[PDB]
Amino acid sequence: TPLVHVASVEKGRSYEDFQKVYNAIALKLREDDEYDNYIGYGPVLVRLAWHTSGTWDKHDNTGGSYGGTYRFKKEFNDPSNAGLQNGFKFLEPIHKEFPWISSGDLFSLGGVTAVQEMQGPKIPWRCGRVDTPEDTTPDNGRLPDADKDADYVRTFFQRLNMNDREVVALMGAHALGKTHLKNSGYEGPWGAANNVFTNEFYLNLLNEDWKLEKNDANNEQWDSKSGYMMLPTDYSLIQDPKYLSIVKEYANDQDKFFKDFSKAFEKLLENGITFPKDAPSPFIFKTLEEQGL
Ligand code: HEM
Ligand SMILES: c1ccc2[nH]cnc2c1
């Protein structure tokens, strides 16, 4: 038996309870849209959601979104998480408005809000994460390096229980935002539409003219004449025949991308968690436009 994480609903709360939390985030998303040269807080929040979950090991159920351990120094100060304090501070007033929601739920909810609010697919989400103690925090080094080839990525994602179709779809999240030299040692966007969820990641991947270069931190990255970039790990998605066909697939069909990403992001956010048979069914929240706001 590995360790068991049982989802316990916050006492007496429900969908229209968490629906209110969704609203505060999507609203704040519209208020501070000047963030990072008017990209907004959308992208950093989905990167934050991915990083609290991507620490998971399917072997012994350590790490993962359940415990909310990012709030702890060690995970917070992980070089792999540099720049995410930007998403933490954004979610902080929202945590004081609803101090009854667990960190784990807040971190995952914010990523879900962000994807739906940037016109992406719907992501069904579940509550029940409970805060665990400091020494539950995973050791640094569990998140992936950007400087590697196709089969590093493949092995790596096996620890997260993800197959080829799932890793190609998750990576489509890289249509969003940009890399920041002081954060990761990489600079530039992957695309033009920075804060709307589309299939541009695969398009650019297959359509631009790419060159291998060193950036100002002296690391290698792929650059296009258009002013975009790709990480070595991104560019391997077309160096590999199995990844390649799934990429071509997502560049032809953005509806398939949306469904595959939805399933893969949900799984990602829930890995390691056991839900009781009497747990409330997954919530599908309405967008701010679906509620006339
Ligand atoms: C091979 C795996 C991955 C690697 C190596 C990787 C690496 C990176 C790096 C280096 C950045 C730049 C951060 C910065 O400079 O500030 C970044 C940004 C981002 N990544 Fe990933 N990533 C990976 C997979 C994913 C996944 C699975 C997701 C979500 C599903 C994701 C979502 C993002 C987002 C949204 C950003 C934008 C952050 C922002 O705009 O501030 N990435 N990624
Ligand atoms: C958002 C803001 C502050 C927090 N403290 C612990 N978890 C948090 C989430």
mmCIF file of C-alpha atoms and ligand atoms in Angstrom:
data_model
loop_
_atom_site.group_PDB
_atom_site.id
_atom_site.type_symbol
_atom_site.label_atom_id
_atom_site.label_comp_id
_atom_site.label_asym_id
_atom_site.label_seq_id
_atom_site.Cartn_x
_atom_site.Cartn_y
_atom_site.Cartn_z
ATOM 1 C CA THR A 1 0.000 0.000 0.000
ATOM 2 C CA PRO A 2 1.180 3.526 -0.723
ATOM 3 C CA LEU A 3 0.061 6.456 1.436
ATOM 4 C CA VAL A 4 -3.638 7.376 1.188
ATOM 5 C CA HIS A 5 -4.953 10.935 0.762
ATOM 6 C CA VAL A 6 -8.684 11.041 1.428
ATOM 7 C CA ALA A 7 -10.600 14.042 0.103
ATOM 8 C CA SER A 8 -12.484 15.690 2.951
ATOM 9 C CA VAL A 9 -14.876 18.456 1.871
ATOM 10 C CA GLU A 10 -14.382 21.689 3.815
ATOM 11 C CA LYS A 11 -17.161 21.511 6.488
ATOM 12 C CA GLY A 12 -20.659 22.022 5.021
ATOM 13 C CA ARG A 13 -19.572 23.800 1.781
ATOM 14 C CA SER A 14 -20.665 23.031 -1.795
ATOM 15 C CA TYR A 15 -20.706 23.944 -5.503
ATOM 16 C CA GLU A 16 -22.229 27.332 -5.243
ATOM 17 C CA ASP A 17 -19.774 27.808 -2.444
ATOM 18 C CA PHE A 18 -16.771 27.140 -4.550
ATOM 19 C CA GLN A 19 -18.550 28.927 -7.375
ATOM 20 C CA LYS A 20 -18.150 32.119 -5.372
ATOM 21 C CA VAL A 21 -14.402 31.454 -5.120
ATOM 22 C CA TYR A 22 -14.155 30.977 -8.888
ATOM 23 C CA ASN A 23 -15.856 34.384 -9.279
ATOM 24 C CA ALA A 24 -13.408 36.284 -7.070
ATOM 25 C CA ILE A 25 -10.450 34.896 -9.037
ATOM 26 C CA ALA A 26 -11.925 35.538 -12.531
ATOM 27 C CA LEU A 27 -12.856 39.045 -11.394
ATOM 28 C CA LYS A 28 -9.370 39.822 -10.014
ATOM 29 C CA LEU A 29 -8.121 38.428 -13.308
ATOM 30 C CA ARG A 30 -9.936 41.279 -15.081
ATOM 31 C CA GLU A 31 -8.848 43.881 -12.531
ATOM 32 C CA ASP A 32 -5.064 43.417 -12.616
ATOM 33 C CA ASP A 33 -4.689 42.749 -16.279
ATOM 34 C CA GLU A 34 -1.726 44.989 -16.488
ATOM 35 C CA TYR A 35 0.441 42.306 -15.065
ATOM 36 C CA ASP A 36 3.566 41.329 -16.972
ATOM 37 C CA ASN A 37 3.045 43.868 -19.834
ATOM 38 C CA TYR A 38 -0.683 43.248 -20.063
ATOM 39 C CA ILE A 39 -0.480 39.459 -20.391
ATOM 40 C CA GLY A 40 -2.442 39.218 -17.142
ATOM 41 C CA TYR A 41 -2.259 36.734 -14.284
ATOM 42 C CA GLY A 42 -3.812 33.901 -16.291
ATOM 43 C CA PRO A 43 -0.658 32.050 -17.440
ATOM 44 C CA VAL A 44 1.243 32.232 -14.113
ATOM 45 C CA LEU A 45 -1.766 30.683 -12.397
ATOM 46 C CA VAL A 46 -1.913 27.678 -14.643
ATOM 47 C CA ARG A 47 1.814 27.255 -14.235
ATOM 48 C CA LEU A 48 1.309 27.432 -10.488
ATOM 49 C CA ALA A 49 -1.433 24.732 -10.728
ATOM 50 C CA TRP A 50 0.881 22.490 -12.768
ATOM 51 C CA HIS A 51 3.818 22.930 -10.375
ATOM 52 C CA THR A 52 1.976 22.025 -7.115
ATOM 53 C CA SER A 53 0.703 18.870 -8.835
ATOM 54 C CA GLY A 54 3.792 17.935 -10.848
ATOM 55 C CA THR A 55 5.786 17.073 -7.727
ATOM 56 C CA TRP A 56 3.915 13.762 -7.532
ATOM 57 C CA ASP A 57 5.472 10.306 -7.520
ATOM 58 C CA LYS A 58 3.018 7.533 -8.427
ATOM 59 C CA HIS A 59 5.219 5.078 -6.597
ATOM 60 C CA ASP A 60 4.643 6.244 -3.063
ATOM 61 C CA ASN A 61 2.214 9.027 -3.453
ATOM 62 C CA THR A 62 4.466 11.723 -2.251
ATOM 63 C CA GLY A 63 4.017 15.220 -3.488
ATOM 64 C CA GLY A 64 1.004 16.232 -5.521
ATOM 65 C CA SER A 65 -1.635 18.922 -5.102
ATOM 66 C CA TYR A 66 -3.367 17.393 -2.023
ATOM 67 C CA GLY A 67 -1.227 18.759 0.798
ATOM 68 C CA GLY A 68 -0.792 22.408 -0.263
ATOM 69 C CA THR A 69 2.841 22.286 0.582
ATOM 70 C CA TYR A 70 3.920 25.078 -1.691
ATOM 71 C CA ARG A 71 2.943 27.446 1.064
ATOM 72 C CA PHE A 72 6.053 26.128 2.769
ATOM 73 C CA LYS A 73 9.443 27.731 2.335
ATOM 74 C CA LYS A 74 11.250 24.754 0.877
ATOM 75 C CA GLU A 75 8.867 24.213 -2.047
ATOM 76 C CA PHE A 76 8.336 27.992 -2.394
ATOM 77 C CA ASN A 77 12.064 28.615 -2.756
ATOM 78 C CA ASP A 78 12.595 25.769 -5.254
ATOM 79 C CA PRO A 79 14.511 27.198 -8.260
ATOM 80 C CA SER A 80 12.024 25.307 -10.449
ATOM 81 C CA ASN A 81 9.257 27.545 -9.027
ATOM 82 C CA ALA A 82 10.971 30.966 -9.543
ATOM 83 C CA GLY A 83 8.425 33.502 -10.637
ATOM 84 C CA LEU A 84 5.492 31.771 -9.076
ATOM 85 C CA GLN A 85 5.450 34.042 -6.072
ATOM 86 C CA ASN A 86 3.671 36.212 -8.488
ATOM 87 C CA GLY A 87 0.770 33.826 -8.499
ATOM 88 C CA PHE A 88 0.945 33.279 -4.765
ATOM 89 C CA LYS A 89 0.579 36.961 -3.961
ATOM 90 C CA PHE A 90 -2.337 37.212 -6.339
ATOM 91 C CA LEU A 91 -4.213 34.449 -4.607
ATOM 92 C CA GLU A 92 -3.522 35.872 -1.217
ATOM 93 C CA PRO A 93 -6.331 38.347 -0.788
ATOM 94 C CA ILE A 94 -8.603 35.716 -2.119
ATOM 95 C CA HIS A 95 -7.490 33.405 0.648
ATOM 96 C CA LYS A 96 -8.334 36.047 3.260
ATOM 97 C CA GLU A 97 -11.756 36.527 1.689
ATOM 98 C CA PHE A 98 -12.439 32.794 1.947
ATOM 99 C CA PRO A 99 -10.101 31.536 4.711
ATOM 100 C CA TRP A 100 -12.056 28.222 4.851
ATOM 101 C CA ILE A 101 -10.750 26.845 1.531
ATOM 102 C CA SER A 102 -7.558 24.716 1.666
ATOM 103 C CA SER A 103 -4.385 25.880 -0.076
ATOM 104 C CA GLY A 104 -4.427 22.790 -2.237
ATOM 105 C CA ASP A 105 -7.929 23.581 -3.435
ATOM 106 C CA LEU A 106 -7.104 27.246 -3.950
ATOM 107 C CA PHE A 107 -3.949 26.541 -6.007
ATOM 108 C CA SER A 108 -5.769 24.001 -8.207
ATOM 109 C CA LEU A 109 -8.927 26.100 -8.516
ATOM 110 C CA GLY A 110 -6.930 29.117 -9.764
ATOM 111 C CA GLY A 111 -5.487 27.090 -12.648
ATOM 112 C CA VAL A 112 -8.954 25.868 -13.612
ATOM 113 C CA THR A 113 -10.346 29.393 -13.455
ATOM 114 C CA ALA A 114 -7.486 30.676 -15.592
ATOM 115 C CA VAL A 115 -7.980 28.081 -18.364
ATOM 116 C CA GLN A 116 -11.724 28.653 -18.630
ATOM 117 C CA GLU A 117 -11.388 32.456 -18.422
ATOM 118 C CA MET A 118 -8.862 32.586 -21.284
ATOM 119 C CA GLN A 119 -11.560 30.879 -23.376
ATOM 120 C CA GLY A 120 -10.101 27.403 -22.996
ATOM 121 C CA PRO A 121 -11.989 24.150 -22.543
ATOM 122 C CA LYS A 122 -13.975 23.335 -19.429
ATOM 123 C CA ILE A 123 -12.135 21.553 -16.675
ATOM 124 C CA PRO A 124 -14.104 19.608 -14.144
ATOM 125 C CA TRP A 125 -12.701 20.131 -10.698
ATOM 126 C CA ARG A 126 -13.088 18.457 -7.308
ATOM 127 C CA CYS A 127 -12.729 19.760 -3.758
ATOM 128 C CA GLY A 128 -11.358 17.970 -0.698
ATOM 129 C CA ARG A 129 -7.693 18.737 -0.424
ATOM 130 C CA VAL A 130 -6.471 19.121 3.127
ATOM 131 C CA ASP A 131 -3.431 20.951 4.380
ATOM 132 C CA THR A 132 -0.651 18.689 5.603
ATOM 133 C CA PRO A 133 2.426 19.512 7.754
ATOM 134 C CA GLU A 134 5.744 21.019 6.765
ATOM 135 C CA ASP A 135 7.629 17.765 6.575
ATOM 136 C CA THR A 136 5.161 16.608 4.020
ATOM 137 C CA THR A 137 6.830 18.943 1.641
ATOM 138 C CA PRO A 138 8.670 17.193 -1.163
ATOM 139 C CA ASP A 139 12.357 17.715 -1.830
ATOM 140 C CA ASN A 140 13.388 19.991 -4.649
ATOM 141 C CA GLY A 141 14.173 18.385 -7.965
ATOM 142 C CA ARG A 142 10.943 16.720 -8.909
ATOM 143 C CA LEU A 143 9.887 19.088 -11.667
ATOM 144 C CA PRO A 144 11.403 18.813 -15.139
ATOM 145 C CA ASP A 145 14.487 20.413 -16.779
ATOM 146 C CA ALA A 146 14.015 22.341 -20.055
ATOM 147 C CA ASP A 147 17.347 21.404 -21.625
ATOM 148 C CA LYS A 148 16.591 17.798 -22.542
ATOM 149 C CA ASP A 149 15.494 15.572 -25.348
ATOM 150 C CA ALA A 150 12.411 13.606 -26.193
ATOM 151 C CA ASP A 151 12.947 10.615 -24.060
ATOM 152 C CA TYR A 152 13.796 12.463 -20.937
ATOM 153 C CA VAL A 153 10.363 13.935 -21.184
ATOM 154 C CA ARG A 154 8.930 10.523 -21.822
ATOM 155 C CA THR A 155 10.512 8.839 -18.839
ATOM 156 C CA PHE A 156 9.837 11.809 -16.700
ATOM 157 C CA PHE A 157 6.158 11.924 -17.279
ATOM 158 C CA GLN A 158 5.814 8.231 -16.478
ATOM 159 C CA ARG A 159 6.285 9.140 -12.830
ATOM 160 C CA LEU A 160 3.160 11.316 -13.163
ATOM 161 C CA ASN A 161 1.300 8.416 -14.783
ATOM 162 C CA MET A 162 1.012 10.189 -18.150
ATOM 163 C CA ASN A 163 1.301 8.647 -21.640
ATOM 164 C CA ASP A 164 2.269 10.145 -25.021
ATOM 165 C CA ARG A 165 -1.112 11.641 -25.862
ATOM 166 C CA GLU A 166 -1.353 13.154 -22.380
ATOM 167 C CA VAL A 167 2.071 14.887 -22.396
ATOM 168 C CA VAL A 168 1.594 16.412 -25.833
ATOM 169 C CA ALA A 169 -1.809 17.804 -24.787
ATOM 170 C CA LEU A 170 -0.586 19.190 -21.444
ATOM 171 C CA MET A 171 2.221 21.012 -23.246
ATOM 172 C CA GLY A 172 -0.324 22.967 -25.305
ATOM 173 C CA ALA A 173 -0.535 25.083 -22.155
ATOM 174 C CA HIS A 174 2.623 26.714 -23.516
ATOM 175 C CA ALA A 175 0.539 28.834 -25.887
ATOM 176 C CA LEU A 176 0.098 30.836 -22.723
ATOM 177 C CA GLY A 177 2.528 33.334 -21.323
ATOM 178 C CA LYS A 178 6.263 33.607 -21.720
ATOM 179 C CA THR A 179 9.599 32.601 -20.310
ATOM 180 C CA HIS A 180 11.466 35.185 -18.242
ATOM 181 C CA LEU A 181 15.254 35.206 -18.320
ATOM 182 C CA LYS A 182 15.577 35.913 -14.597
ATOM 183 C CA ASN A 183 13.120 33.149 -13.749
ATOM 184 C CA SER A 184 14.193 30.207 -15.792
ATOM 185 C CA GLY A 185 17.199 31.280 -17.844
ATOM 186 C CA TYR A 186 15.051 31.463 -21.006
ATOM 187 C CA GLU A 187 13.469 34.479 -22.720
ATOM 188 C CA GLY A 188 10.609 34.996 -25.164
ATOM 189 C CA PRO A 189 7.025 33.860 -25.808
ATOM 190 C CA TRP A 190 5.967 30.715 -27.629
ATOM 191 C CA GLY A 191 3.249 32.702 -29.400
ATOM 192 C CA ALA A 192 1.351 35.891 -30.236
ATOM 193 C CA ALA A 193 -1.928 35.186 -28.426
ATOM 194 C CA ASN A 194 -0.453 35.249 -24.915
ATOM 195 C CA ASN A 195 -3.590 35.174 -22.790
ATOM 196 C CA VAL A 196 -6.168 33.243 -24.812
ATOM 197 C CA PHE A 197 -6.242 29.428 -24.821
ATOM 198 C CA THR A 198 -5.826 28.031 -28.395
ATOM 199 C CA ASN A 199 -3.857 25.431 -30.339
ATOM 200 C CA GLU A 200 -1.191 27.909 -31.471
ATOM 201 C CA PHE A 201 1.540 25.948 -29.664
ATOM 202 C CA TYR A 202 1.410 23.109 -32.218
ATOM 203 C CA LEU A 203 0.838 25.493 -35.167
ATOM 204 C CA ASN A 204 3.954 27.545 -34.438
ATOM 205 C CA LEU A 205 5.750 24.317 -33.694
ATOM 206 C CA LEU A 206 5.001 23.144 -37.230
ATOM 207 C CA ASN A 207 5.040 26.395 -39.202
ATOM 208 C CA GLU A 208 7.875 28.649 -38.231
ATOM 209 C CA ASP A 209 11.472 28.595 -39.222
ATOM 210 C CA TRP A 210 13.483 27.602 -36.154
ATOM 211 C CA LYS A 211 17.155 28.094 -35.269
ATOM 212 C CA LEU A 212 19.214 26.733 -32.401
ATOM 213 C CA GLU A 213 20.757 29.606 -30.442
ATOM 214 C CA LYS A 214 22.187 30.588 -27.077
ATOM 215 C CA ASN A 215 20.137 33.232 -25.193
ATOM 216 C CA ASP A 216 21.608 35.865 -22.821
ATOM 217 C CA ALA A 217 21.947 33.310 -20.019
ATOM 218 C CA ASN A 218 24.000 31.308 -22.499
ATOM 219 C CA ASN A 219 21.469 28.477 -22.700
ATOM 220 C CA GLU A 220 20.215 26.889 -25.887
ATOM 221 C CA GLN A 221 16.730 27.623 -27.169
ATOM 222 C CA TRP A 222 14.953 27.452 -30.535
ATOM 223 C CA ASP A 223 14.193 30.864 -32.069
ATOM 224 C CA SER A 224 11.958 31.844 -34.933
ATOM 225 C CA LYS A 225 12.209 34.816 -37.191
ATOM 226 C CA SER A 226 8.831 35.878 -35.903
ATOM 227 C CA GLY A 227 10.210 36.481 -32.452
ATOM 228 C CA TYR A 228 8.978 33.356 -30.739
ATOM 229 C CA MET A 229 10.906 30.616 -29.021
ATOM 230 C CA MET A 230 10.734 26.963 -28.062
ATOM 231 C CA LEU A 231 12.507 25.136 -25.245
ATOM 232 C CA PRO A 232 14.701 22.144 -26.161
ATOM 233 C CA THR A 233 12.004 20.007 -24.471
ATOM 234 C CA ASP A 234 9.266 21.703 -26.589
ATOM 235 C CA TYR A 235 11.219 21.240 -29.814
ATOM 236 C CA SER A 236 11.722 17.551 -29.077
ATOM 237 C CA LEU A 237 7.989 17.123 -29.517
ATOM 238 C CA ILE A 238 8.696 17.229 -33.263
ATOM 239 C CA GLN A 239 12.030 15.405 -33.188
ATOM 240 C CA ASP A 240 10.225 12.308 -31.924
ATOM 241 C CA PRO A 241 7.939 10.369 -34.385
ATOM 242 C CA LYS A 242 5.362 9.369 -31.707
ATOM 243 C CA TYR A 243 5.079 12.885 -30.268
ATOM 244 C CA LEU A 244 5.174 14.283 -33.830
ATOM 245 C CA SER A 245 1.951 12.644 -35.020
ATOM 246 C CA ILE A 246 0.031 13.791 -31.942
ATOM 247 C CA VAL A 247 1.266 17.326 -32.538
ATOM 248 C CA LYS A 248 0.097 17.256 -36.174
ATOM 249 C CA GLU A 249 -3.166 15.915 -34.828
ATOM 250 C CA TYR A 250 -3.625 18.873 -32.427
ATOM 251 C CA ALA A 251 -2.614 21.432 -35.073
ATOM 252 C CA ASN A 252 -5.405 20.151 -37.377
ATOM 253 C CA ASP A 253 -8.071 19.801 -34.691
ATOM 254 C CA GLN A 254 -8.413 22.239 -31.796
ATOM 255 C CA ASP A 255 -11.559 20.528 -30.536
ATOM 256 C CA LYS A 256 -9.725 17.277 -29.929
ATOM 257 C CA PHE A 257 -6.970 19.257 -28.203
ATOM 258 C CA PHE A 258 -9.501 20.821 -25.858
ATOM 259 C CA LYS A 259 -11.027 17.590 -24.736
ATOM 260 C CA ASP A 260 -7.696 15.764 -24.370
ATOM 261 C CA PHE A 261 -6.240 18.706 -22.409
ATOM 262 C CA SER A 262 -9.303 18.837 -20.173
ATOM 263 C CA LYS A 263 -9.008 15.196 -19.203
ATOM 264 C CA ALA A 264 -5.226 15.518 -18.768
ATOM 265 C CA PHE A 265 -5.319 18.672 -16.659
ATOM 266 C CA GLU A 266 -8.016 17.177 -14.389
ATOM 267 C CA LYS A 267 -6.060 13.987 -13.884
ATOM 268 C CA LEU A 268 -2.961 16.042 -13.281
ATOM 269 C CA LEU A 269 -4.617 18.054 -10.607
ATOM 270 C CA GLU A 270 -6.109 14.974 -8.860
ATOM 271 C CA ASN A 271 -3.220 12.475 -8.975
ATOM 272 C CA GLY A 272 -2.672 10.902 -5.557
ATOM 273 C CA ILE A 273 -6.164 11.631 -4.218
ATOM 274 C CA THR A 274 -8.796 9.129 -3.128
ATOM 275 C CA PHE A 275 -12.417 10.237 -3.473
ATOM 276 C CA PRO A 276 -15.082 8.469 -1.304
ATOM 277 C CA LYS A 277 -18.178 7.096 -3.086
ATOM 278 C CA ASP A 278 -20.302 9.649 -1.229
ATOM 279 C CA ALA A 279 -18.133 12.588 -2.307
ATOM 280 C CA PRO A 280 -19.861 15.352 -4.276
ATOM 281 C CA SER A 281 -19.543 14.938 -8.056
ATOM 282 C CA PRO A 282 -17.015 17.086 -9.940
ATOM 283 C CA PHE A 283 -17.981 20.704 -10.326
ATOM 284 C CA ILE A 284 -18.247 22.316 -13.740
ATOM 285 C CA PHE A 285 -18.150 26.059 -12.999
ATOM 286 C CA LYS A 286 -19.730 28.637 -15.299
ATOM 287 C CA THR A 287 -17.500 31.233 -16.954
ATOM 288 C CA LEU A 288 -18.005 34.880 -16.003
ATOM 289 C CA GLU A 289 -19.732 35.399 -19.342
ATOM 290 C CA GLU A 290 -22.072 32.494 -18.713
ATOM 291 C CA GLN A 291 -23.298 34.368 -15.638
ATOM 292 C CA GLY A 292 -23.592 37.802 -17.114
ATOM 293 C CA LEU A 293 -20.652 39.403 -15.430
HETATM 294 C C1 HEM B 1 8.615 19.313 -20.072
HETATM 295 C C2 HEM B 1 7.863 19.948 -19.190
HETATM 296 C C3 HEM B 1 7.858 21.403 -19.005
HETATM 297 C C4 HEM B 1 8.903 22.228 -18.893
HETATM 298 C C5 HEM B 1 10.343 21.821 -18.930
HETATM 299 C C6 HEM B 1 8.398 23.519 -18.733
HETATM 300 C C7 HEM B 1 9.237 24.609 -18.576
HETATM 301 C C8 HEM B 1 8.764 25.882 -18.488
HETATM 302 C C9 HEM B 1 9.553 27.014 -18.345
HETATM 303 C C10 HEM B 1 11.046 27.044 -18.220
HETATM 304 C C11 HEM B 1 8.745 28.069 -18.307
HETATM 305 C C12 HEM B 1 9.176 29.494 -18.162
HETATM 306 C C13 HEM B 1 9.006 30.067 -16.764
HETATM 307 C C14 HEM B 1 9.659 31.397 -16.625
HETATM 308 O O1 HEM B 1 10.658 31.654 -17.263
HETATM 309 O O2 HEM B 1 9.235 32.258 -15.889
HETATM 310 C C15 HEM B 1 7.449 27.601 -18.456
HETATM 311 C C16 HEM B 1 6.356 28.416 -18.503
HETATM 312 C C17 HEM B 1 5.098 27.879 -18.453
HETATM 313 N N1 HEM B 1 4.751 26.590 -18.435
HETATM 314 FE FE1 HEM B 1 5.850 25.141 -18.548
HETATM 315 N N2 HEM B 1 7.081 23.495 -18.739
HETATM 316 C C18 HEM B 1 6.689 22.246 -18.902
HETATM 317 C C19 HEM B 1 5.427 21.724 -18.957
HETATM 318 C C20 HEM B 1 4.333 22.486 -18.678
HETATM 319 C C21 HEM B 1 3.096 22.010 -18.339
HETATM 320 C C22 HEM B 1 2.689 20.584 -18.203
HETATM 321 C C23 HEM B 1 2.306 23.089 -18.146
HETATM 322 C C24 HEM B 1 0.898 23.103 -17.768
HETATM 323 C C25 HEM B 1 0.115 22.093 -18.053
HETATM 324 C C26 HEM B 1 3.070 24.221 -18.379
HETATM 325 C C27 HEM B 1 2.599 25.485 -18.311
HETATM 326 C C28 HEM B 1 3.443 26.567 -18.375
HETATM 327 C C29 HEM B 1 2.915 27.904 -18.359
HETATM 328 C C30 HEM B 1 1.472 28.276 -18.302
HETATM 329 C C31 HEM B 1 3.936 28.739 -18.394
HETATM 330 C C32 HEM B 1 3.844 30.248 -18.427
HETATM 331 C C33 HEM B 1 4.221 30.952 -17.138
HETATM 332 C C34 HEM B 1 4.111 32.424 -17.228
HETATM 333 O O3 HEM B 1 3.581 32.927 -18.170
HETATM 334 O O4 HEM B 1 4.536 33.159 -16.361
HETATM 335 N N3 HEM B 1 4.313 23.822 -18.671
HETATM 336 N N4 HEM B 1 7.466 26.243 -18.566
HETATM 337 C C1 LIG B 2 -3.042 31.738 -1.012
HETATM 338 C C2 LIG B 2 -2.638 32.824 -0.228
HETATM 339 C C3 LIG B 2 -2.070 32.605 1.025
HETATM 340 C C4 LIG B 2 -1.902 31.279 1.506
HETATM 341 N N1 LIG B 2 -1.383 30.765 2.680
HETATM 342 C C5 LIG B 2 -1.462 29.419 2.627
HETATM 343 N N2 LIG B 2 -2.017 29.065 1.451
HETATM 344 C C6 LIG B 2 -2.298 30.215 0.739
HETATM 345 C C7 LIG B 2 -2.878 30.438 -0.539
#
